[PDB]
Design a protein around this ligand. Structure first.
Ligand code: MG
Ligand code: MG
Ligand code: MG
Ligand code: MG
Ligand code: ZN
Lengths: 117, 24, 98, 60, 155, 206
RNA sequence: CAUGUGGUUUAAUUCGAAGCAACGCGAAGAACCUUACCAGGCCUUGACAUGCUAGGGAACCCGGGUGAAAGCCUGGGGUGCCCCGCGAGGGGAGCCCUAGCACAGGUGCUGCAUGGCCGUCGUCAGCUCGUGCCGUGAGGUGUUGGGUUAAGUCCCGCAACGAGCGCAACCCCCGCCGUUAGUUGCCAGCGGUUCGGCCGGGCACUCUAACGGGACUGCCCGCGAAAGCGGGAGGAAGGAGGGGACGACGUCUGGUCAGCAUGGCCCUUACGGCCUGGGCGACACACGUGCUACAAUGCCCACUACAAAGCGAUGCCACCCGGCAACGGGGAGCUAAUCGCAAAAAGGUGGGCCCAGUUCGGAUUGGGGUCUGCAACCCGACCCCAUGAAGCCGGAAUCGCUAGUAAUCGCGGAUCA
């Protein structure tokens, strides 16, 4: 906006520092301003801190989980490796595939194989 | 002697003039 | 020939009334020396804060009494009527003499 | 003797060496500035209020 | 202060010879903030130097302050709750400070009437190897080697 | 604490004199002396409509007695009788050219002196001291303000030991100049003693 | 020795403040004034406000007896306004004497009954709120942690994310410069000149204020993840440039009813009011903050030079005469960057002093004078002559300040005869 004329260099870089940290974490959450119908996680043990929130909020719990996990506190479990890009990719790809498949226009999976190595 | 009742700075400190201090 | 004194407090109000006269006199008459600020005589009053005993932390004020001089030469009839009608003083006690 | 005194201060019956200074506002016996005619106390009170023209907060 | 070391005050170099050590001496002489007075008083002795000996007041001043420069001193210090008179090297600045200082005092010690002559005669004995200020220096260094036993705590 | 009066603090920059006018070193006292008794009589027989900023202007026999009021409907009476007789009593004891320029108040809730004198009266009328302050501060903030603060002090209700009820909301940076925070002192007579009142309304900026 | 205080004394020697933060504090001006205390003389609806009735009188001006003053007692002048009335008279708005009631008034207590204002921890770096989370709960969390900072400042981190009162930052003074205005100053430029920027003349300069600019770890190099730190250049000034104002939630049953407001209390021919005189100034003593010295880096005499800030029309006094002098008589300028207090002092030049209870030191005391004020015994201040005391750098202990600071030397202002 043409409102940048004001605001001294002080508020400038600071407000820009605001945008930087704001996107540093929120990028991927702001897209929805309502309580998600469910939650998907890579390791229910580590991010169990969130699991509790969804659990207390009656939000269904689905998540890929390694042996280092607590399956009893997960609604729909996803057993298997987790500390490997290989295992995580195969699951996340096919999972999101079900999302677009039930949505419309089944596209090709995102370029992950290249990032893997 | 800023206290001498008969000197230069004697009256100067006392804010006065008199004889020993020049006066019109 | 004529000389005008513009004593007053607030220099903001003094600046407006002084500049006003400068435009009025010059734009409707001969030459006029601009606003001439003089050494502002100030009444610095110091005093204690608390009512009882407190020979410290005392508070003090100051009375800003400004001064501004403006000289008009040739006595123009246009400038006399201009300053006699188009004027907007207030807290500015002015005094004029030949 | 507070009331009868503030009245006597404005009397000046005998010699002039009795017309001592006397604050107007709260009528103080001392600390009466001649310029303002007020006491130091009521002086600052008004100053904060802004009822004292040209009297701004001193700072230097 | 507890934070910074606080840097020294770089004084103005001599306005006649060109040397900071000299001006610093004027400051020690300076009573009640009268530099120009003390300056002349110093240069008065400088002329008294050439009167007695054909020697330049410059080196006569260096020789004096040099022979009055305390090499070591004893400093008090606590340890669990006891003070030890531990000796050790002094800082070059402090040495210069004490030297210039003691001399000024040693001049005051003299019976001489005028201040200049006091500074004059004192600067002679100091440059020599025996004077009021010099002996006070010799005294302090004794304390150091005396308590050399406690020198184990160099810290 | 200390807290110098925030008005005298903004005295120079923000708000200007509640009484603006020049005077020579000759009669400044006498001028301000009569200037005082004026505003005093106004506070007396005019507090009815709830006056606040009793602005004053003088220069030479001219005195613009501008008086801000919550509702000038009472200061004028009907057509022109209350206001007229007021100018009467004014110059009746004075000699200067009185000129009562009455002016309304866009919102008494955002006017500190009014908000204070308001609740201060409630306490005199025996009311819920605690919540009286709560609604007062909530009144100003919900009104349109951007900072509120109210504090009473003295025998709350009538207890022996003194006390001071603190209550406020929004922002009240009293240390800052560019704040334009109106002060609102007020008394409060009680059958058991006195009672202090304070009020702060942050509004302006830059 | 000046001044505050303790104590003692006194008819009174008014009261308050009590470690730091009471002690040159309230007092920024006690000869009666002030004054709240004491003694002697009077008033006692009063010196002030509001209201009503009653006998009388307009208002208002001057005099007298008495007195220490106050007060008491008492004589002369006088008669505006309106209505009924030609007139006479009398009524009355209003002002005043007296009698009467409601009432005034109180610096008389309670600052643990209070407001307001102020001291203080301390400009110390902190203290809290909303929501969420853990705990049966008080409560924790955030605010802790690593680094950094004048800082809860910011950065990284984290069951917390965010906000608020604070520090910061906006306003004033001093610094660098410019724009605007040139009766302050200026041969900077030129000419005249009783050579004083005096005349003309000029706004560049200094200055006078008014507005804006500049500094932002901005730029280069090293360290670092960041914030930031360090060294340098440019610059008048670098890492908040020096200084001021600003002193949070709370704290101290902190201070003040004697500034004022104010609940209650208590007195009312006196706990109120006026006067004269006395008293806060009383001194066998002790403490606090100070001033002046103990001297040759110094003291006296003469001559000479550089400030800032502030103040002044019944006030500041140029300058002239007089006196050794304070100061008096005469008398110009000045609502005052334009006249004046006004000589800044220390310093600078030349001279005397020669270590001495001293030409150091100026207390004490005798004699004589001037100014203010009705009035200087108590109890003022300053002159000139004489007097020239203690102290030759101070026990235990103890205070101040990190740069234009300490020390040191001057001037002004409020206050106010
Ligand atoms: Mg009392
Ligand atoms: Mg108490
Ligand atoms: Mg300039
Ligand atoms: Mg004699
Ligand atoms: Zn008063």
């Amino acid at each position: 906006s043409p409102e940048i004329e004001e605001r001294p260099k002080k508020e400038q870089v600071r407000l820009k520092h605001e945008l930087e940290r704001l996107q540093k974490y929120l990028s991927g959450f702001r897209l929805l301003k309502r309580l998600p119908d469910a939650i998907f996680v890579v390791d229910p043990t580590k991010e169990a801190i969130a699991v509790r929130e969804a659990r207390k909020l009656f939000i269904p719990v689905i998540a890929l989980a390694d042996t280092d996990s607590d399956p009893d506190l997960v609604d729909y479990i996803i057993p298997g490796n987790d500390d490997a890009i290989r295992s995580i990719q195969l699951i996340l790809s096919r999972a999101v595939d079900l999302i677009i498949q039930a949505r419309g226009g089944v596209v090709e999976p995102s370029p992950s194989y290249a990032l893997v190595q | 002697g800023k206290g001498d009742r008969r000197t230069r700075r004697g009256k100067i400190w006392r804010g006065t003039y008199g004889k020993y201090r020049p006066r019109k | 020939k004529i000389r005008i004194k513009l004593r007053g407090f607030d220099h903001k109000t003094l600046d407006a009334s002084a500049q006003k006269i400068v435009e009025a006199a010059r734009r409707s008459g001969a030459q006029v020396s601009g606003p001439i600020p003089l050494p502002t005589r100030v009444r610095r009053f110091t005093v204690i804060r608390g009512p009882f005993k407190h020979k410290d932390s005392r508070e003090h004020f100051e009375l800003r009494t400004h001064n501004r001089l403006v000289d008009i030469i040739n006595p123009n009839r246009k400038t006399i009527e201009q300053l006699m009608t188009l004027d907007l003083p207030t807290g500015v006690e002015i005094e004029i003499k030949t | 003797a507070r009331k009868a005194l503030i009245e006597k201060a404005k009397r000046t019956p005998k010699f002039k060496v009795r017309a001592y200074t006397r604050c107007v506002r709260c009528g103080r016996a001392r600390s009466v500035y001649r310029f303002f005619g007020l006491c130091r106390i009521c002086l600052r009170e008004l100053a904060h209020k802004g009822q004292l023209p040209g009297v701004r907060k001193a700072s230097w | 202060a507890r934070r910074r070391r606080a840097e020294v005050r770089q004084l103005q170099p001599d306005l006649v010879y060109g040397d900071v050590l000299v001006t610093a001496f004027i400051n020690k002489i300076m009573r009640d903030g009268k530099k120009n007075l003390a300056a002349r008083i110093f240069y008065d002795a400088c002329k008294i130097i050439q009167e007695k000996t054909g020697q330049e007041p410059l080196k006569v001043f260096k020789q004096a302050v040099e022979n009055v420069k305390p090499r070591m001193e004893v400093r008090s210090r606590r340890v669990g709750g006891a003070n030890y008179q531990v000796p050790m090297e002094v800082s070059p600045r402090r040495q210069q400070s004490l030297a210039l200082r003691w001399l000024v005092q040693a001049a005051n010690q003299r019976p001489e009437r005028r201040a200049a002559v006091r500074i004059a005669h004192e600067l002679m004995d100091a440059a020599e190897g025996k004077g009021g200020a010099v002996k006070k220096k010799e005294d302090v260094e004794r304390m150091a080697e005396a308590n050399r036993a406690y020198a184990h705590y160099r810290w | 604490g200390n807290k110098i009066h925030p008005i005298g603090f903004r005295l120079g920059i923000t708000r200007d004199w509640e009484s603006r006018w020049y005077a020579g070193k000759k009669q400044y006292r006498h001028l301000l002396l009569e200037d005082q008794r004026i505003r005093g009589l106004l506070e007396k027989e005019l507090y009815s409509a709830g006056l606040a900023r009793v602005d004053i202007e003088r220069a030479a026999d001219n005195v613009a007695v501008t008086v801000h009021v919550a509702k000038p409907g009472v200061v004028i009476g009907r057509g022109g009788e209350r206001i007229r007789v007021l100018r009467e009593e004014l110059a009746k004891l004075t000699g200067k050219n009185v000129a009562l320029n009455v002016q309304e108040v866009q919102n008494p809730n955002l006017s500190a002196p009014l908000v204070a004198q308001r609740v201060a009266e409630q306490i005199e009328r025996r009311f819920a001291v605690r919540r009286a302050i709560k609604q007062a501060v909530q009144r100003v903030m919900e009104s349109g303000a951007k900072g509120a603060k109210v504090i009473v002090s003295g025998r709350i209700g009538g207890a022996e030991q003194a006390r001071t009820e603190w209550a406020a909301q929004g922002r009240v940076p009293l240390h800052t100049l560019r704040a334009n925070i109106d002060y609102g002192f007020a008394l409060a007579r009680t059958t058991y003693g006195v009672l202090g009142v304070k009020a702060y309304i942050f509004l302006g900026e830059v």
